[PDB]
Amino acid sequence: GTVTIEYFNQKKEMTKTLEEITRDFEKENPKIKVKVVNVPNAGEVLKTRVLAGDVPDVVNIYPQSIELQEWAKAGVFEDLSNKDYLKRVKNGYAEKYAVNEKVYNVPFTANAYGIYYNKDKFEELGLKVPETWDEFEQLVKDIVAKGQTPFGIAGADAWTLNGYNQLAFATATGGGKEANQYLRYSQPNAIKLSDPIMKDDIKVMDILRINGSKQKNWEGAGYTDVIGAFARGDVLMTPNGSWAITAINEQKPNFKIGTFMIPGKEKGQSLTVGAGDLAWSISATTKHPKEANAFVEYMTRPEVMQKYYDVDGSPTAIEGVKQAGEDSPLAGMTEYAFTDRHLVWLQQYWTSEADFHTLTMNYVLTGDKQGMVNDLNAFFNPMKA
Ligand SMILES: OC[C@H]1O[C@H](OC[C@H]2O[C@H](O[C@]3(CO)O[C@H](CO)[C@@H](O)[C@@H]3O)[C@H](O)[C@@H](O)[C@@H]2O)[C@H](O)[C@@H](O)[C@H]1O
């Protein structure tokens, strides 16, 4: 009678809201039960489960990932090309992450990356949003001079600075394809310390390495600790994705939250990075395909999607959803969503990303400029060969 399906979740920040939508689905479909699964190291466990052959019915997988690309070709995921609900996805966002000209992922939302800032304290200290690298250098120094902590960096979570270093190369080269040309599709051992592009990368990275730029006990600070630190007003800024604001809002800040994109060398060269945030795939070997499809179809509904957006905040590709204006806290970060200024994660054409997080954070810890170059070459050479 009643059949149970599973939804593998990687959106830890939205657990409470996604479970609320699930119950709303369960109340409308009494013959269907859905288990929302949240596990630590969800990326590794999903790899484990896909190999083991215990693929969850509905899977939150990021559509730019090589995992999605490889598994879709293998036939792990159901083809969703001829589904009616795929027409509810505007901006041709479903077709963007097509594999063999076939859609295997429904990306509901698009995540972005930038800098969160405390509007109140910024006004209090009379500081403006930077528009160049040099202005971003000056802002950090001026916060230090005022006796405040500019950045809250999570030293124990290297992934938090993934978007930062990816935008460091992006603003240095011009975009995503330009960044992958220097790092990924270049010759083996092409990345040199003398390269102006690498000199630019270091310069952008050195902004996090200004004297007194980071909070006390940052080396062993987690993602949760930095959210709390920013919410209390211990730090004025924190670099993170658009996925963080729901957890920041949770902590009840005593200030209005603002965002801005990482600037380029000159004005009007700022970029953002991201892909499908809330992005769902259906297992091809699911025992209950009708029930699983209905669950995905449910999330494509505008009044259901409004429930998610009003909490999350990331731009949605779903039609009929009233999105927040330019007064929104995520505005400065997510303004250029679905434009040329928003480039896909660079690990769309990599084999992994874990080591890129390491070498990014290692530099913030050490400052070894040659060491970072060595790490970059050591990371990208296996992909070229
Ligand atoms: O830049 C980091 C990350 O961005 C994209 O994934 C967005 C995703 O990141 C975070 O999720 C975690 C850490 O909390 O990261 C892994 C996935 O990489 C998950 O196991 C875990 O939940 C945020 O907490 C999420 O809200 C957000 O959805 C991109 O897809 C990744 O490749 C990676 O570059």
Side-chain angles (χ1 to χ4, degrees), residues 1-15 17-19 21-26 28-30 32 34 36-43 45-53 55-86 88-89 91-127 129-198 200-255 257-266 268-286 288-289 291-325 327-339 341-385:
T2 64
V3 292
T4 310
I5 62 157
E6 188 195 334
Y7 162 67
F8 194 88
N9 183 45
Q10 292 197 55
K11 287 287 300 170
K12 278 179 171 64
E13 295 96 338
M14 288 300 291
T15 295
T17 310
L18 281 163
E19 278 182 305
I21 287 165
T22 299
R23 293 188 224 99
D24 294 358
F25 175 85
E26 279 175 334
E28 286 171 42
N29 308 282
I32 311 171
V34 187
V36 179
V37 165
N38 282 289
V39 287
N41 304 311
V45 174
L46 190 65
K47 289 171 194 171
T48 293
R49 286 189 67 175
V50 164
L51 182 66
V55 188
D57 307 297
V58 181
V59 164
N60 177 215
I61 186 166
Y62 308 100
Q64 88 290 348
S65 65
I66 190 162
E67 286 87 13
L68 192 274
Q69 291 170 50
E70 285 169 345
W71 295 335
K73 284 174 185 176
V76 178
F77 297 116
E78 186 184 331
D79 182 34
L80 310 169
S81 301
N82 306 131
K83 301 284 177 180
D84 288 318
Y85 59 75
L86 208 81
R88 291 171 176 173
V89 181
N91 310 324
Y93 200 58
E95 295 170 303
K96 192 181 188 182
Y97 310 98
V99 182
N100 289 328
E101 295 194 327
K102 290 173 171 73
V103 177
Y104 296 91
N105 185 294
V106 180
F108 300 90
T109 59
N111 58 41
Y113 193 96
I115 316 290
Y116 293 92
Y117 80 95
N118 182 330
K119 278 188 170 175
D120 282 21
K121 278 179 177 286
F122 260 67
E123 197 171 41
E124 188 192 344
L125 301 164
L127 303 165
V129 160
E131 288 179 316
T132 62
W133 289 338
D134 288 342
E135 280 165 35
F136 194 28
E137 284 174 351
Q138 192 58 62
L139 175 69
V140 176
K141 285 176 185 175
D142 293 334
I143 292 164
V144 167
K146 286 288 208 301
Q148 294 272 19
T149 303
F151 295 111
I153 309 291
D157 291 316
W159 63 263
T160 59
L161 295 192
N162 180 42
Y164 185 89
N165 205 20
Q166 281 194 24
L167 280 177
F169 281 108
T171 56
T173 56
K177 290 181 185 71
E178 286 78 27
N180 272 336
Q181 263 280 59
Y182 176 81
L183 291 163
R184 167 69 182 88
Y185 296 120
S186 60
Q187 274 290 114
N189 293 28
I191 302 157
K192 306 158 198 287
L193 187 73
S194 63
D195 288 9
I197 289 164
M198 192 61 210
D200 286 329
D201 173 63
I202 286 166
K203 179 182 176 65
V204 177
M205 284 301 296
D206 274 341
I207 301 168
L208 294 181
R209 283 191 44 78
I210 296 167
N211 295 317
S213 60
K214 300 166 294 300
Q215 80 278 20
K216 210 163 186 293
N217 296 321
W218 79 267
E219 305 96 297
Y223 170 59
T224 313
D225 295 305
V226 162
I227 291 162
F230 172 73
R232 290 183 298 267
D234 300 348
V235 297
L236 270 71
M237 299 178 294
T238 184
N240 222 307
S242 57
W243 50 72
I245 202 155
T246 181
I248 301 163
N249 288 334
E250 190 87 350
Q251 291 289 310
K252 300 271 188 173
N254 191 45
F255 65 91
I257 305 159
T259 49
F260 63 89
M261 289 153 82
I262 285 91
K265 189 167 191 168
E266 284 158 21
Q269 286 181 336
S270 65
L271 291 160
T272 185
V273 62
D277 200 38
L278 187 69
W280 287 5
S281 289
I282 301 166
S283 173
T285 57
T286 187
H288 311 105
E291 284 74 37
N293 268 283
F295 184 76
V296 173
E297 185 273 312
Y298 187 70
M299 196 71 254
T300 63
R301 295 180 194 188
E303 72 280 356
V304 173
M305 188 54 211
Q306 193 73 63
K307 203 96 164 183
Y308 179 95
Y309 173 88
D310 286 346
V311 177
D312 178 58
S314 289
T316 183
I318 300 300
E319 288 177 18
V321 183
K322 190 181 186 295
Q323 283 193 226
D327 194 48
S328 65
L330 270 179
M333 192 187 283
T334 61
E335 257 172 333
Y336 289 98
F338 314 114
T339 68
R341 301 271 183 269
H342 185 281
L343 56 103
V344 181
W345 294 108
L346 289 175
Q347 72 263 13
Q348 192 185 31
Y349 303 102
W350 303 350
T351 53
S352 68
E353 59 169 323
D355 288 341
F356 186 81
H357 308 150
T358 304
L359 65 87
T360 293
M361 187 60 75
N362 276 352
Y363 180 75
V364 189
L365 283 160
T366 61
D368 194 10
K369 298 181 184 181
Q370 185 62 61
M372 183 160 66
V373 164
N374 294 346
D375 285 318
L376 280 163
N377 285 308
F379 172 66
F380 280 114
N381 282 324
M383 301 181 197
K384 295 167 183 175

